[PDB]
Amino acid sequence: HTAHLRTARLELTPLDPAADARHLHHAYGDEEVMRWWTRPACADPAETERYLTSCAAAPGARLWTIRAPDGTVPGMAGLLGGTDVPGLTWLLRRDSWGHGYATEAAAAVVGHALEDGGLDRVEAWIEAGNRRSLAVAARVGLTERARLAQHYPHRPGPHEMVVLGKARAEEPLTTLAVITELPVRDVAATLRLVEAALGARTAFAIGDPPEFAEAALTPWSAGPRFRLAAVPGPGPVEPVRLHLDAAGTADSLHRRAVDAGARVDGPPVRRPWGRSEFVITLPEGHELTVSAPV
Amino acid sequence: HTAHLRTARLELTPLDPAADARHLHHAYGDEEVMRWWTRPACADPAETERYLTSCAAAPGARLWTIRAPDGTVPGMAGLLGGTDVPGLTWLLRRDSWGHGYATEAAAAVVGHALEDGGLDRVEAWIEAGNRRSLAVAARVGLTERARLAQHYPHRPGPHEMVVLGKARAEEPLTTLAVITELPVRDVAATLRLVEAALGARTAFAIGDPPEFAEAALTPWSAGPRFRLAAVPGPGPVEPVRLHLDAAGTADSLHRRAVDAGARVDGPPVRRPWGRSEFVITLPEGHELTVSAPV
Ligand SMILES: CC(C)(COP(=O)(O)OP(=O)(O)OC[C@H]1O[C@@H](n2cnc3c(N)ncnc32)[C@H](O)[C@@H]1OP(=O)(O)O)[C@@H](O)C(=O)NCCC(=O)NCCS
């Protein structure tokens, strides 16, 4: 990793923790600049230096330092290591905001990444409230692809992350969603359960009473959801297993399910892969496991 | 129906096809304005009148005509009927663009719809390319909630629809994904099939051959996917029913499945609800029905 990236007004030089740390500290040391970061602002240029090293260390991590015409070092931008599908970062010091640097830099990294960089696509996870970042990602050409929940140990609670992406390959055929059907005796009754326990809603319902319905797990369209189909009187129903990635605290999600009178596992159990989970079992046997960051 | 909306500079009067059609035809009859529309530009004011009447007829439809101070009718805006999740529209005549009318009207409709409209949320499905429309939705406070694929009869092929929405209040406990598990005999075998027929990819595996894996239906960190689990007992497995909302042409998706040697119930059959579908059956019974706009 020694690729030098040249833009209209910037020069991206391979990040060298040792010499750059001093400059990059007006960024990582700034609490206002680190508000959306995965960790608290570094206390001193030394801390910044070590962290920049672990970051640079990561497998496949190729970070660059940004140098402006005036000879300033606006900040850093590059690809994160340990993602499988190429990650993306950047951060500037306040004094260097609103100059279209981030967008110019990020664009250099992504264009390079897809160009003679050896990558078919790139990602960028940005928090929901990070307007600044989302805007840059948009300017660069990264479009939303999914959403996930995460939790930073320094933060009091979890948060939603936006997975934006861009590919040199415009995959034509692709799947937008997967709606799984659950055989149930009383669709209506189920719908009432699901709405209460999981905060779902009836996207639609055929039959009076319902014979086949769809429970939307979000108040929008084209979101997570599963269908319900009424089962033929007698005869057991082989359980269906669903994994629900939810937003919010497992405690709240659990409190809701219980208060909704649903058949729950027991309190959420902290799983090794860093996710708290608990299971909801429907009368028919079906098991809906609910997992959150915390 | 009634309701008259007043803004800073505009007056939104309940749409009256008969009276307004003449004016609104400067929009509906213009090919450049009608670019991103669900149907071609209207041939004449009469056609525009007819269309406006059906639109007005739609269940729950509440449209408004936009009148400017200078006594002109820049265009129209309002709420779409029979959409389940409150819909939204708007359009202006070419010579009325770039005046902030759309944003003003739209803002009024939304503002009215959430407070005094007795509605909880509102949506706006805009095409990826429609930059001007996306900007309006933005200025109004509509944020991306999803994406879907659609096809307009007059169009040669399908397109990507962005789903933006706004709520008087958001729900914390929401689900971001639903991963369903499929009991299979040979996880490795299934994965090879799925990868071929559904262009999937193994997000991860557990074993050699894996006894538990996850097939991501997209090349991104998050998104549509299901888990495979090696069935223990050497007995029969009750099939699971999965519905996949695909992007692209049904023909293509079909060709790919067949060429991947997958068990297809037959070519794509046009379903009444405007969706082309065919079914893929996994050796263990599981039926994955694939549906695309066309
Ligand atoms: C409906 C729509 C997209 C209007 O475009 P628009 O006129 O640019 O939207 P506005 O009416 O909010 O105009 C905003 C522009 O006018 C400017 N403007 C001028 N005077 C203004 C004022 N007093 N207040 C606010 N903005 C003003 C804005 O700054 C902005 O300039 P810019 O976008 O060029 O940088 C229009 O282009 C259209 O008819 N599109 C086709 C119909 C369609 O596809 N609809 C989608 C179905 S949901």
Side-chain angles (χ1 to χ4, degrees), chain A residues 85 123 174 176-177 179-181 219-221 225 241-243 245 247, chain B residues 121 123 145 173-177 179-181 221 241-243 245 247:
Chain A
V85 51
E123 266 181 7
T174 171
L176 286 165
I179 340 281
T180 150
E181 172 187 303
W220 320 113
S221 325
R225 69 236 198 239
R241 266 121 206 129
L242 292 184
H243 184 83
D245 291 319
Chain B
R121 82 255 144 135
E123 280 183 346
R145 303 326 240 256
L173 322 184
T174 157
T175 110
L176 320 174
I179 340 270
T180 134
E181 182 187 297
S221 283
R241 253 110 206 169
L242 282 191
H243 189 107
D245 284 322

PDB file of all heavy atoms in Angstrom, chain A residues 85 123 174 176-177 179-181 219-221 225 241-243 245 247, chain B residues 121 123 145 173-177 179-181 221 241-243 245 247:
ATOM      1  N   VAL A  85     -16.450  -7.092   2.234  1.00  0.00           N
ATOM      2  CA  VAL A  85     -16.859  -6.214   1.148  1.00  0.00           C
ATOM      3  C   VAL A  85     -16.321  -4.834   1.579  1.00  0.00           C
ATOM      4  O   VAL A  85     -16.801  -4.237   2.548  1.00  0.00           O
ATOM      5  CB  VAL A  85     -18.404  -6.196   0.967  1.00  0.00           C
ATOM      6  CG1 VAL A  85     -19.089  -5.922   2.291  1.00  0.00           C
ATOM      7  CG2 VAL A  85     -18.799  -5.164  -0.090  1.00  0.00           C
ATOM      8  N   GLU A 123     -18.515  -0.134   0.186  1.00  0.00           N
ATOM      9  CA  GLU A 123     -19.576   0.198   1.120  1.00  0.00           C
ATOM     10  C   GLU A 123     -19.192   1.359   2.017  1.00  0.00           C
ATOM     11  O   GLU A 123     -18.044   1.802   2.034  1.00  0.00           O
ATOM     12  CB  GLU A 123     -19.904  -1.011   1.994  1.00  0.00           C
ATOM     13  CG  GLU A 123     -21.043  -1.863   1.473  1.00  0.00           C
ATOM     14  CD  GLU A 123     -21.349  -3.026   2.386  1.00  0.00           C
ATOM     15  OE1 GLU A 123     -20.763  -3.081   3.491  1.00  0.00           O
ATOM     16  OE2 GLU A 123     -22.173  -3.883   2.001  1.00  0.00           O
ATOM     17  N   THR A 174     -31.404  -9.173  -9.259  1.00  0.00           N
ATOM     18  CA  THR A 174     -31.102  -9.126  -7.836  1.00  0.00           C
ATOM     19  C   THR A 174     -32.377  -9.204  -7.012  1.00  0.00           C
ATOM     20  O   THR A 174     -33.461  -8.884  -7.497  1.00  0.00           O
ATOM     21  CB  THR A 174     -30.364  -7.830  -7.479  1.00  0.00           C
ATOM     22  OG1 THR A 174     -30.272  -7.711  -6.058  1.00  0.00           O
ATOM     23  CG2 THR A 174     -31.106  -6.631  -8.032  1.00  0.00           C
ATOM     24  N   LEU A 176     -34.816  -8.048  -3.963  1.00  0.00           N
ATOM     25  CA  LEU A 176     -35.151  -6.877  -3.169  1.00  0.00           C
ATOM     26  C   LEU A 176     -35.596  -7.254  -1.766  1.00  0.00           C
ATOM     27  O   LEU A 176     -35.296  -6.551  -0.795  1.00  0.00           O
ATOM     28  CB  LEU A 176     -36.249  -6.078  -3.870  1.00  0.00           C
ATOM     29  CG  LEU A 176     -35.723  -5.317  -5.093  1.00  0.00           C
ATOM     30  CD1 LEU A 176     -36.884  -4.855  -5.955  1.00  0.00           C
ATOM     31  CD2 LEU A 176     -34.882  -4.135  -4.636  1.00  0.00           C
ATOM     32  N   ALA A 177     -36.308  -8.370  -1.651  1.00  0.00           N
ATOM     33  CA  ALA A 177     -36.776  -8.803  -0.347  1.00  0.00           C
ATOM     34  C   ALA A 177     -37.154 -10.265  -0.335  1.00  0.00           C
ATOM     35  O   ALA A 177     -37.365 -10.873  -1.380  1.00  0.00           O
ATOM     36  CB  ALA A 177     -37.967  -7.963   0.081  1.00  0.00           C
ATOM     37  N   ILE A 179     -39.948 -12.561   1.579  1.00  0.00           N
ATOM     38  CA  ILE A 179     -41.122 -12.657   2.441  1.00  0.00           C
ATOM     39  C   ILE A 179     -41.424 -14.131   2.669  1.00  0.00           C
ATOM     40  O   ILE A 179     -41.759 -14.863   1.741  1.00  0.00           O
ATOM     41  CB  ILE A 179     -42.384 -12.006   1.807  1.00  0.00           C
ATOM     42  CG1 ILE A 179     -41.984 -11.020   0.701  1.00  0.00           C
ATOM     43  CG2 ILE A 179     -43.228 -11.359   2.893  1.00  0.00           C
ATOM     44  CD1 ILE A 179     -41.510  -9.690   1.193  1.00  0.00           C
ATOM     45  N   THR A 180     -41.308 -14.565   3.910  1.00  0.00           N
ATOM     46  CA  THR A 180     -41.566 -15.952   4.231  1.00  0.00           C
ATOM     47  C   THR A 180     -42.985 -16.137   4.772  1.00  0.00           C
ATOM     48  O   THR A 180     -43.486 -15.321   5.536  1.00  0.00           O
ATOM     49  CB  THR A 180     -40.518 -16.468   5.252  1.00  0.00           C
ATOM     50  OG1 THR A 180     -41.096 -17.494   6.071  1.00  0.00           O
ATOM     51  CG2 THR A 180     -40.009 -15.317   6.121  1.00  0.00           C
ATOM     52  N   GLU A 181     -43.627 -17.221   4.364  1.00  0.00           N
ATOM     53  CA  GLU A 181     -44.986 -17.522   4.784  1.00  0.00           C
ATOM     54  C   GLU A 181     -45.028 -18.433   6.003  1.00  0.00           C
ATOM     55  O   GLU A 181     -44.275 -19.396   6.094  1.00  0.00           O
ATOM     56  CB  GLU A 181     -45.732 -18.168   3.626  1.00  0.00           C
ATOM     57  CG  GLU A 181     -47.097 -18.695   3.968  1.00  0.00           C
ATOM     58  CD  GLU A 181     -47.691 -19.468   2.810  1.00  0.00           C
ATOM     59  OE1 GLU A 181     -47.816 -18.886   1.709  1.00  0.00           O
ATOM     60  OE2 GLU A 181     -48.021 -20.659   2.996  1.00  0.00           O
ATOM     61  N   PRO A 219     -43.505   0.588   9.219  1.00  0.00           N
ATOM     62  CA  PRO A 219     -44.622   1.403   8.733  1.00  0.00           C
ATOM     63  C   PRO A 219     -44.521   1.856   7.279  1.00  0.00           C
ATOM     64  O   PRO A 219     -45.373   2.604   6.799  1.00  0.00           O
ATOM     65  CB  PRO A 219     -44.638   2.580   9.695  1.00  0.00           C
ATOM     66  CG  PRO A 219     -43.205   2.717  10.132  1.00  0.00           C
ATOM     67  CD  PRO A 219     -42.587   1.353  10.083  1.00  0.00           C
ATOM     68  N   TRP A 220     -43.490   1.404   6.578  1.00  0.00           N
ATOM     69  CA  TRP A 220     -43.305   1.778   5.180  1.00  0.00           C
ATOM     70  C   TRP A 220     -43.626   0.610   4.250  1.00  0.00           C
ATOM     71  O   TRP A 220     -44.182  -0.404   4.672  1.00  0.00           O
ATOM     72  CB  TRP A 220     -41.868   2.257   4.973  1.00  0.00           C
ATOM     73  CG  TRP A 220     -41.392   3.101   6.120  1.00  0.00           C
ATOM     74  CD1 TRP A 220     -40.403   2.798   7.021  1.00  0.00           C
ATOM     75  CD2 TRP A 220     -41.931   4.363   6.529  1.00  0.00           C
ATOM     76  NE1 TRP A 220     -40.299   3.796   7.970  1.00  0.00           N
ATOM     77  CE2 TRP A 220     -41.224   4.767   7.691  1.00  0.00           C
ATOM     78  CE3 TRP A 220     -42.946   5.195   6.029  1.00  0.00           C
ATOM     79  CZ2 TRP A 220     -41.501   5.960   8.351  1.00  0.00           C
ATOM     80  CZ3 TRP A 220     -43.219   6.380   6.688  1.00  0.00           C
ATOM     81  CH2 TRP A 220     -42.498   6.751   7.839  1.00  0.00           C
ATOM     82  N   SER A 221     -43.298   0.759   2.975  1.00  0.00           N
ATOM     83  CA  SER A 221     -43.543  -0.310   2.017  1.00  0.00           C
ATOM     84  C   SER A 221     -42.194  -0.934   1.657  1.00  0.00           C
ATOM     85  O   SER A 221     -41.140  -0.348   1.927  1.00  0.00           O
ATOM     86  CB  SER A 221     -44.212   0.239   0.752  1.00  0.00           C
ATOM     87  OG  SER A 221     -45.104   1.299   1.048  1.00  0.00           O
ATOM     88  N   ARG A 225     -40.970  -8.150   6.353  1.00  0.00           N
ATOM     89  CA  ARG A 225     -42.332  -8.615   6.546  1.00  0.00           C
ATOM     90  C   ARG A 225     -42.477 -10.088   6.189  1.00  0.00           C
ATOM     91  O   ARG A 225     -41.663 -10.646   5.453  1.00  0.00           O
ATOM     92  CB  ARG A 225     -43.285  -7.796   5.679  1.00  0.00           C
ATOM     93  CG  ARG A 225     -43.133  -8.033   4.190  1.00  0.00           C
ATOM     94  CD  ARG A 225     -42.873  -6.729   3.481  1.00  0.00           C
ATOM     95  NE  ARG A 225     -43.135  -6.790   2.047  1.00  0.00           N
ATOM     96  CZ  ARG A 225     -42.227  -6.535   1.105  1.00  0.00           C
ATOM     97  NH1 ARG A 225     -40.987  -6.201   1.443  1.00  0.00           N
ATOM     98  NH2 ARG A 225     -42.566  -6.599  -0.181  1.00  0.00           N
ATOM     99  N   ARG A 241     -38.449 -21.297  11.325  1.00  0.00           N
ATOM    100  CA  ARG A 241     -37.516 -20.485  12.109  1.00  0.00           C
ATOM    101  C   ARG A 241     -37.153 -19.189  11.415  1.00  0.00           C
ATOM    102  O   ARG A 241     -36.624 -19.185  10.304  1.00  0.00           O
ATOM    103  CB  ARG A 241     -36.235 -21.269  12.405  1.00  0.00           C
ATOM    104  CG  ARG A 241     -36.248 -21.986  13.742  1.00  0.00           C
ATOM    105  CD  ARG A 241     -36.052 -23.478  13.556  1.00  0.00           C
ATOM    106  NE  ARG A 241     -36.642 -24.243  14.649  1.00  0.00           N
ATOM    107  CZ  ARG A 241     -37.480 -25.262  14.482  1.00  0.00           C
ATOM    108  NH1 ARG A 241     -37.833 -25.643  13.261  1.00  0.00           N
ATOM    109  NH2 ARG A 241     -37.971 -25.894  15.537  1.00  0.00           N
ATOM    110  N   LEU A 242     -37.441 -18.082  12.086  1.00  0.00           N
ATOM    111  CA  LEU A 242     -37.145 -16.774  11.534  1.00  0.00           C
ATOM    112  C   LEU A 242     -36.213 -16.014  12.461  1.00  0.00           C
ATOM    113  O   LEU A 242     -36.330 -16.073  13.687  1.00  0.00           O
ATOM    114  CB  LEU A 242     -38.435 -15.970  11.329  1.00  0.00           C
ATOM    115  CG  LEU A 242     -39.434 -16.419  10.253  1.00  0.00           C
ATOM    116  CD1 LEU A 242     -40.575 -15.411  10.188  1.00  0.00           C
ATOM    117  CD2 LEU A 242     -38.748 -16.547   8.890  1.00  0.00           C
ATOM    118  N   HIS A 243     -35.275 -15.307  11.856  1.00  0.00           N
ATOM    119  CA  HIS A 243     -34.326 -14.508  12.601  1.00  0.00           C
ATOM    120  C   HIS A 243     -34.655 -13.052  12.292  1.00  0.00           C
ATOM    121  O   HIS A 243     -34.643 -12.640  11.124  1.00  0.00           O
ATOM    122  CB  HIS A 243     -32.898 -14.837  12.158  1.00  0.00           C
ATOM    123  CG  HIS A 243     -31.845 -14.122  12.945  1.00  0.00           C
ATOM    124  ND1 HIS A 243     -31.397 -14.574  14.167  1.00  0.00           N
ATOM    125  CD2 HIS A 243     -31.180 -12.969  12.699  1.00  0.00           C
ATOM    126  CE1 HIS A 243     -30.499 -13.728  14.641  1.00  0.00           C
ATOM    127  NE2 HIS A 243     -30.348 -12.745  13.770  1.00  0.00           N
ATOM    128  N   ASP A 245     -33.617  -9.217  12.848  1.00  0.00           N
ATOM    129  CA  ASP A 245     -32.617  -8.260  13.275  1.00  0.00           C
ATOM    130  C   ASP A 245     -33.407  -6.996  13.591  1.00  0.00           C
ATOM    131  O   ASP A 245     -33.977  -6.362  12.700  1.00  0.00           O
ATOM    132  CB  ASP A 245     -31.608  -8.024  12.153  1.00  0.00           C
ATOM    133  CG  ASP A 245     -30.739  -9.237  11.892  1.00  0.00           C
ATOM    134  OD1 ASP A 245     -30.321  -9.894  12.871  1.00  0.00           O
ATOM    135  OD2 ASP A 245     -30.473  -9.531  10.710  1.00  0.00           O
ATOM    136  N   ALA A 247     -33.971  -3.126  15.784  1.00  0.00           N
ATOM    137  CA  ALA A 247     -33.305  -1.908  16.218  1.00  0.00           C
ATOM    138  C   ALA A 247     -33.787  -1.591  17.627  1.00  0.00           C
ATOM    139  O   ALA A 247     -34.941  -1.836  17.969  1.00  0.00           O
ATOM    140  CB  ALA A 247     -33.644  -0.766  15.276  1.00  0.00           C
TER     141      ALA A 247
ATOM    142  N   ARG B 121     -48.365   8.744   8.907  1.00  0.00           N
ATOM    143  CA  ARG B 121     -47.186   8.868   8.062  1.00  0.00           C
ATOM    144  C   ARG B 121     -47.593   9.082   6.608  1.00  0.00           C
ATOM    145  O   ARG B 121     -48.780   9.058   6.280  1.00  0.00           O
ATOM    146  CB  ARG B 121     -46.291   7.619   8.198  1.00  0.00           C
ATOM    147  CG  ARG B 121     -46.706   6.414   7.358  1.00  0.00           C
ATOM    148  CD  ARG B 121     -47.364   5.334   8.206  1.00  0.00           C
ATOM    149  NE  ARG B 121     -48.447   4.661   7.487  1.00  0.00           N
ATOM    150  CZ  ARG B 121     -48.627   3.342   7.459  1.00  0.00           C
ATOM    151  NH1 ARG B 121     -47.793   2.544   8.114  1.00  0.00           N
ATOM    152  NH2 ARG B 121     -49.634   2.819   6.767  1.00  0.00           N
ATOM    153  N   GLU B 123     -45.888   8.581   2.313  1.00  0.00           N
ATOM    154  CA  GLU B 123     -44.832   8.104   1.429  1.00  0.00           C
ATOM    155  C   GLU B 123     -44.825   8.798   0.070  1.00  0.00           C
ATOM    156  O   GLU B 123     -45.789   9.450  -0.327  1.00  0.00           O
ATOM    157  CB  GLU B 123     -44.985   6.604   1.197  1.00  0.00           C
ATOM    158  CG  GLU B 123     -44.454   5.728   2.302  1.00  0.00           C
ATOM    159  CD  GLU B 123     -44.570   4.260   1.957  1.00  0.00           C
ATOM    160  OE1 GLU B 123     -45.290   3.933   0.984  1.00  0.00           O
ATOM    161  OE2 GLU B 123     -43.941   3.436   2.656  1.00  0.00           O
ATOM    162  N   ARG B 145     -36.857   5.098   2.869  1.00  0.00           N
ATOM    163  CA  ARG B 145     -37.297   4.019   3.737  1.00  0.00           C
ATOM    164  C   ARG B 145     -37.100   2.667   3.068  1.00  0.00           C
ATOM    165  O   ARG B 145     -37.028   1.642   3.748  1.00  0.00           O
ATOM    166  CB  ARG B 145     -38.777   4.180   4.103  1.00  0.00           C
ATOM    167  CG  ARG B 145     -39.147   5.488   4.772  1.00  0.00           C
ATOM    168  CD  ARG B 145     -38.038   5.990   5.647  1.00  0.00           C
ATOM    169  NE  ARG B 145     -38.458   6.121   7.032  1.00  0.00           N
ATOM    170  CZ  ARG B 145     -38.731   7.281   7.618  1.00  0.00           C
ATOM    171  NH1 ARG B 145     -38.632   8.412   6.940  1.00  0.00           N
ATOM    172  NH2 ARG B 145     -39.089   7.311   8.891  1.00  0.00           N
ATOM    173  N   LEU B 173     -38.387   0.601  18.381  1.00  0.00           N
ATOM    174  CA  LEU B 173     -38.348  -0.838  18.167  1.00  0.00           C
ATOM    175  C   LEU B 173     -38.876  -1.232  16.797  1.00  0.00           C
ATOM    176  O   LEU B 173     -40.069  -1.460  16.615  1.00  0.00           O
ATOM    177  CB  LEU B 173     -39.155  -1.556  19.249  1.00  0.00           C
ATOM    178  CG  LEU B 173     -39.044  -0.970  20.651  1.00  0.00           C
ATOM    179  CD1 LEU B 173     -39.821  -1.851  21.628  1.00  0.00           C
ATOM    180  CD2 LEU B 173     -37.569  -0.854  21.050  1.00  0.00           C
ATOM    181  N   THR B 174     -37.971  -1.320  15.834  1.00  0.00           N
ATOM    182  CA  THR B 174     -38.345  -1.694  14.488  1.00  0.00           C
ATOM    183  C   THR B 174     -37.407  -2.811  14.041  1.00  0.00           C
ATOM    184  O   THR B 174     -36.319  -2.986  14.599  1.00  0.00           O
ATOM    185  CB  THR B 174     -38.246  -0.470  13.551  1.00  0.00           C
ATOM    186  OG1 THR B 174     -38.080  -0.903  12.199  1.00  0.00           O
ATOM    187  CG2 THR B 174     -37.072   0.413  13.952  1.00  0.00           C
ATOM    188  N   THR B 175     -37.831  -3.593  13.058  1.00  0.00           N
ATOM    189  CA  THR B 175     -36.987  -4.672  12.584  1.00  0.00           C
ATOM    190  C   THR B 175     -36.383  -4.297  11.236  1.00  0.00           C
ATOM    191  O   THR B 175     -37.077  -3.817  10.337  1.00  0.00           O
ATOM    192  CB  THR B 175     -37.773  -5.990  12.501  1.00  0.00           C
ATOM    193  OG1 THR B 175     -37.962  -6.357  11.130  1.00  0.00           O
ATOM    194  CG2 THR B 175     -39.127  -5.850  13.195  1.00  0.00           C
ATOM    195  N   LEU B 176     -35.077  -4.505  11.112  1.00  0.00           N
ATOM    196  CA  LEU B 176     -34.362  -4.160   9.892  1.00  0.00           C
ATOM    197  C   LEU B 176     -34.219  -5.317   8.898  1.00  0.00           C
ATOM    198  O   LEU B 176     -34.046  -5.091   7.696  1.00  0.00           O
ATOM    199  CB  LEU B 176     -32.987  -3.579  10.260  1.00  0.00           C
ATOM    200  CG  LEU B 176     -33.005  -2.633  11.475  1.00  0.00           C
ATOM    201  CD1 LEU B 176     -31.588  -2.229  11.843  1.00  0.00           C
ATOM    202  CD2 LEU B 176     -33.843  -1.402  11.172  1.00  0.00           C
ATOM    203  N   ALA B 177     -34.305  -6.553   9.381  1.00  0.00           N
ATOM    204  CA  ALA B 177     -34.192  -7.697   8.484  1.00  0.00           C
ATOM    205  C   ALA B 177     -34.853  -8.948   9.036  1.00  0.00           C
ATOM    206  O   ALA B 177     -34.995  -9.098  10.247  1.00  0.00           O
ATOM    207  CB  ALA B 177     -32.726  -7.972   8.189  1.00  0.00           C
ATOM    208  N   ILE B 179     -34.333 -12.963   8.470  1.00  0.00           N
ATOM    209  CA  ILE B 179     -33.612 -14.070   7.856  1.00  0.00           C
ATOM    210  C   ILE B 179     -34.324 -15.350   8.235  1.00  0.00           C
ATOM    211  O   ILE B 179     -34.437 -15.666   9.423  1.00  0.00           O
ATOM    212  CB  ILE B 179     -32.156 -14.178   8.365  1.00  0.00           C
ATOM    213  CG1 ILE B 179     -31.709 -12.845   8.976  1.00  0.00           C
ATOM    214  CG2 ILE B 179     -31.246 -14.621   7.236  1.00  0.00           C
ATOM    215  CD1 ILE B 179     -31.055 -11.895   8.001  1.00  0.00           C
ATOM    216  N   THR B 180     -34.820 -16.080   7.241  1.00  0.00           N
ATOM    217  CA  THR B 180     -35.509 -17.333   7.526  1.00  0.00           C
ATOM    218  C   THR B 180     -34.558 -18.513   7.270  1.00  0.00           C
ATOM    219  O   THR B 180     -33.739 -18.475   6.348  1.00  0.00           O
ATOM    220  CB  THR B 180     -36.827 -17.454   6.685  1.00  0.00           C
ATOM    221  OG1 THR B 180     -36.923 -18.758   6.102  1.00  0.00           O
ATOM    222  CG2 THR B 180     -36.874 -16.393   5.600  1.00  0.00           C
ATOM    223  N   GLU B 181     -34.662 -19.547   8.105  1.00  0.00           N
ATOM    224  CA  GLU B 181     -33.813 -20.733   7.998  1.00  0.00           C
ATOM    225  C   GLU B 181     -34.423 -21.887   7.208  1.00  0.00           C
ATOM    226  O   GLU B 181     -35.586 -22.239   7.417  1.00  0.00           O
ATOM    227  CB  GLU B 181     -33.467 -21.229   9.388  1.00  0.00           C
ATOM    228  CG  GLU B 181     -32.556 -22.431   9.395  1.00  0.00           C
ATOM    229  CD  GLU B 181     -32.390 -22.980  10.780  1.00  0.00           C
ATOM    230  OE1 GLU B 181     -31.847 -22.254  11.638  1.00  0.00           O
ATOM    231  OE2 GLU B 181     -32.813 -24.129  11.016  1.00  0.00           O
ATOM    232  N   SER B 221     -22.987  -6.316   2.562  1.00  0.00           N
ATOM    233  CA  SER B 221     -22.908  -6.744   3.953  1.00  0.00           C
ATOM    234  C   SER B 221     -24.258  -7.104   4.539  1.00  0.00           C
ATOM    235  O   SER B 221     -24.382  -8.069   5.294  1.00  0.00           O
ATOM    236  CB  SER B 221     -22.272  -5.646   4.805  1.00  0.00           C
ATOM    237  OG  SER B 221     -20.870  -5.622   4.628  1.00  0.00           O
ATOM    238  N   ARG B 241     -42.263 -21.984   2.500  1.00  0.00           N
ATOM    239  CA  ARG B 241     -42.659 -21.141   1.372  1.00  0.00           C
ATOM    240  C   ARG B 241     -42.024 -19.765   1.488  1.00  0.00           C
ATOM    241  O   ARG B 241     -42.286 -19.041   2.440  1.00  0.00           O
ATOM    242  CB  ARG B 241     -44.183 -20.998   1.318  1.00  0.00           C
ATOM    243  CG  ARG B 241     -44.848 -21.772   0.190  1.00  0.00           C
ATOM    244  CD  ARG B 241     -45.646 -22.947   0.736  1.00  0.00           C
ATOM    245  NE  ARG B 241     -45.794 -24.025  -0.242  1.00  0.00           N
ATOM    246  CZ  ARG B 241     -46.265 -25.238   0.041  1.00  0.00           C
ATOM    247  NH1 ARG B 241     -46.636 -25.533   1.278  1.00  0.00           N
ATOM    248  NH2 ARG B 241     -46.366 -26.159  -0.908  1.00  0.00           N
ATOM    249  N   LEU B 242     -41.192 -19.415   0.515  1.00  0.00           N
ATOM    250  CA  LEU B 242     -40.516 -18.128   0.507  1.00  0.00           C
ATOM    251  C   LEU B 242     -40.873 -17.366  -0.750  1.00  0.00           C
ATOM    252  O   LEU B 242     -40.954 -17.940  -1.837  1.00  0.00           O
ATOM    253  CB  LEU B 242     -38.999 -18.312   0.561  1.00  0.00           C
ATOM    254  CG  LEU B 242     -38.332 -18.652   1.900  1.00  0.00           C
ATOM    255  CD1 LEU B 242     -36.819 -18.513   1.751  1.00  0.00           C
ATOM    256  CD2 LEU B 242     -38.830 -17.735   3.000  1.00  0.00           C
ATOM    257  N   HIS B 243     -41.078 -16.065  -0.595  1.00  0.00           N
ATOM    258  CA  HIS B 243     -41.423 -15.205  -1.711  1.00  0.00           C
ATOM    259  C   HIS B 243     -40.295 -14.209  -1.910  1.00  0.00           C
ATOM    260  O   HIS B 243     -39.932 -13.481  -0.981  1.00  0.00           O
ATOM    261  CB  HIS B 243     -42.731 -14.476  -1.417  1.00  0.00           C
ATOM    262  CG  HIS B 243     -43.278 -13.727  -2.590  1.00  0.00           C
ATOM    263  ND1 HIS B 243     -44.387 -14.149  -3.292  1.00  0.00           N
ATOM    264  CD2 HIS B 243     -42.863 -12.585  -3.188  1.00  0.00           C
ATOM    265  CE1 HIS B 243     -44.630 -13.298  -4.274  1.00  0.00           C
ATOM    266  NE2 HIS B 243     -43.719 -12.341  -4.233  1.00  0.00           N
ATOM    267  N   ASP B 245     -38.955 -10.927  -3.924  1.00  0.00           N
ATOM    268  CA  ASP B 245     -39.233  -9.781  -4.774  1.00  0.00           C
ATOM    269  C   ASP B 245     -37.937  -9.496  -5.490  1.00  0.00           C
ATOM    270  O   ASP B 245     -36.977  -9.011  -4.893  1.00  0.00           O
ATOM    271  CB  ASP B 245     -39.659  -8.581  -3.938  1.00  0.00           C
ATOM    272  CG  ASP B 245     -41.087  -8.698  -3.448  1.00  0.00           C
ATOM    273  OD1 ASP B 245     -41.944  -9.200  -4.215  1.00  0.00           O
ATOM    274  OD2 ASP B 245     -41.349  -8.294  -2.294  1.00  0.00           O
ATOM    275  N   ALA B 247     -35.516  -8.019  -8.859  1.00  0.00           N
ATOM    276  CA  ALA B 247     -35.283  -6.844  -9.677  1.00  0.00           C
ATOM    277  C   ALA B 247     -34.809  -7.352 -11.030  1.00  0.00           C
ATOM    278  O   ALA B 247     -33.919  -8.199 -11.097  1.00  0.00           O
ATOM    279  CB  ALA B 247     -34.206  -5.977  -9.040  1.00  0.00           C
TER     280      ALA B 247
END
